[PDB]
Scaffold this active site. Structure first.
Site, PDB file in Angstrom:
ATOM      1  N   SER A 230       8.948  10.254  37.387  1.00 43.50           N
ATOM      2  CA  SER A 230       7.547  10.702  37.331  1.00 43.50           C
ATOM      3  C   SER A 230       7.055  11.208  35.965  1.00 43.50           C
ATOM      4  CB  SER A 230       7.296  11.786  38.397  1.00 43.50           C
ATOM      5  OG  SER A 230       7.249  11.240  39.711  1.00 43.50           O
TER       6      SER A 230
ATOM      7  N   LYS B 264       4.152   9.564  34.079  1.00 44.52           N
ATOM      8  CA  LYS B 264       2.758  10.010  34.291  1.00 44.52           C
ATOM      9  C   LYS B 264       2.204  10.956  33.232  1.00 44.52           C
ATOM     10  CE  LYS B 264       2.785   9.369  39.268  1.00 44.52           C
ATOM     11  NZ  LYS B 264       4.276   9.388  39.493  1.00 44.52           N
TER      12      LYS B 264
ATOM     13  N   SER C 183       1.250  14.005  41.288  1.00 47.23           N
ATOM     14  CA  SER C 183       1.959  12.768  40.912  1.00 47.23           C
ATOM     15  C   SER C 183       1.634  11.545  41.795  1.00 47.23           C
ATOM     16  CB  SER C 183       3.476  12.992  40.851  1.00 47.23           C
ATOM     17  OG  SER C 183       3.888  13.025  39.505  1.00 47.23           O
TER      18      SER C 183
END
Ligand SMILES: *C(=O)[C@H](NC(=O)c1c(-c2ccccc2Cl)noc1C)[C@@H]1N[C@@H](C(=O)O)C(C)(C)S1
Length: 354
Positions: A41, A44, A107
């Site tokens: 993640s 991002k 997220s």
């Protein structure tokens, strides 16, 4: 002995980490900081940087409505299975403000696609922007293939590179960065918590940035915290345990604040030195820097810091251009140069006109 001690670094239960000062860029501690790892993640953070850069440039506003298409349909694309999602459906008309909070706080992988299409027309074009920013930031161990951080076979990053993306977010897109501290947001009637648990830790002032976990990445966290004049960024990748999740990063940050401090000895445009000039409209050059000087030094040692300078040339000859480099400022501790900055002409000196 006390004055010149080098502090021991705590043992960090992760594959790799780095701790940097945001202002000075100084690496306080590191281990395997350039090893290429699955970012999970943390991808991002770059998605958010691109979006923040588009908004800084005025391409769109937070109040602007994004119409959701099929590729951002959460339950329409099994690729999104078992992942963080806003649950967007085609035809929904969602303010940018809400999608960027879906990305930053939650997220949401579907919100990444939605914004990528809105900002850049396609996911490929957007990933191209991510990679152009990789180059501009001069990242040596990073490459993206996806807009959301899905373990795509050829994407990678590193503890160092992720800390540097962190620093870029805070520095270049402060309006986008200020979103990361928000503890919650509401979408579709449903309240959504910021996934960065460290925001609730009373003992620190953590205001960012991004946690992550995929099954190849392990536990990943990029954290930023402040204490007075001082901002630290940590990046911990391939954390081994669920319980070290926030704890290992907290170890590094608290250690950093305890043993180090950031000093700002000089600001752009302020005179550090003066030197005679020949052939000029004035007889003396005002010298300093073209970028604010920040140094990280052992905590307490601020009053031991010494500054001096050397010149490239025996003589200064006009014309002198503003920000023309004419030497080097040395900052020293215990008689030893610890940091160097270019010494520059602050106010232009053209050839004399009489
Ligand atoms: C980020 O690492 C995790 N988000 C996910 O969506 C996820 C994926 C994934 C699937 C499709 C597209 C992108 C991604 Cl990254 N594969 O596994 C996961 C878990 C979020 N971070 C973790 C965490 O920090 O523990 C979750 C909150 C579980 S989701």
């Amino acid at each position: 002995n006390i004055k010149t001690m080098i502090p021991g670094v705590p043992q960090i239960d992760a594959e790799s980490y780095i701790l940097i000062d945001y202002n000075s860029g100084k690496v306080l501690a590191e281990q395997n900081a350039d090893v290429r790892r699955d970012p999970a993640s943390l991808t991002k953070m770059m998605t958010s940087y691109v979006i923040g850069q588009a908004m800084k440039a005025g391409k769109f506003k937070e109040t602007d409505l994004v119409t959701i298409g099929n590729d951002a349909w959460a339950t329409g694309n099994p690729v999104f299975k078992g992942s963080s999602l806003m649950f967007l459906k085609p035809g929904m008309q969602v303010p940018v403000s809400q999608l960027i909070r879906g990305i930053n706080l939650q997220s949401g992988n579907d919100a990444c696609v939605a914004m990528a299409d809105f900002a850049a027309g396609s996911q490929d074009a957007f990933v191209g922007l991510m990679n152009s920013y990789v180059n501009a930031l001069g990242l040596k161990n990073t490459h993206f293939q996806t807009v959301h951080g899905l373990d795509a076979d050829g994407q990678y990053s590193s503890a160092r590179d992720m800390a540097l993306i962190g620093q870029a977010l805070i520095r270049d897109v402060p309006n986008e960065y200020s979103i990361y501290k928000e503890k919650e947001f509401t979408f579709n009637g449903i309240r959504q918590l910021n996934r960065n648990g460290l925001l609730w830790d009373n003992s620190l002032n953590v205001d960012g940035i991004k946690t992550g976990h995929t099954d190849k990445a392990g536990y990943n966290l990029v954290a930023s915290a402040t204490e007075g004049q001082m901002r630290l960024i940590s990046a911990v990748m391939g954390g081994r345990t669920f319980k070290g999740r926030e704890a290992e990063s907290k170890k590094l940050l608290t250690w950093g604040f305890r043993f180090f401090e950031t000093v700002n000895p000089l600001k752009v445009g302020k005179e550090f030195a003066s030197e005679p000039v020949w052939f000029g409209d004035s007889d003396r050059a005002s010298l300093g820097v073209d970028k604010d000087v920040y140094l990280t030094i052992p905590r307490g040692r601020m009053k031991d810091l010494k500054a001096s300078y050397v010149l490239n040339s025996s003589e200064l000859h006009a014309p002198l251009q503003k920000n023309q480099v004419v030497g080097t400022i040395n900052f020293q501790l215990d008689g030893k140069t610890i940091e160097q900055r270019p010494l520059v002409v602050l106010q232009e000196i053209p050839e004399g006109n009489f």
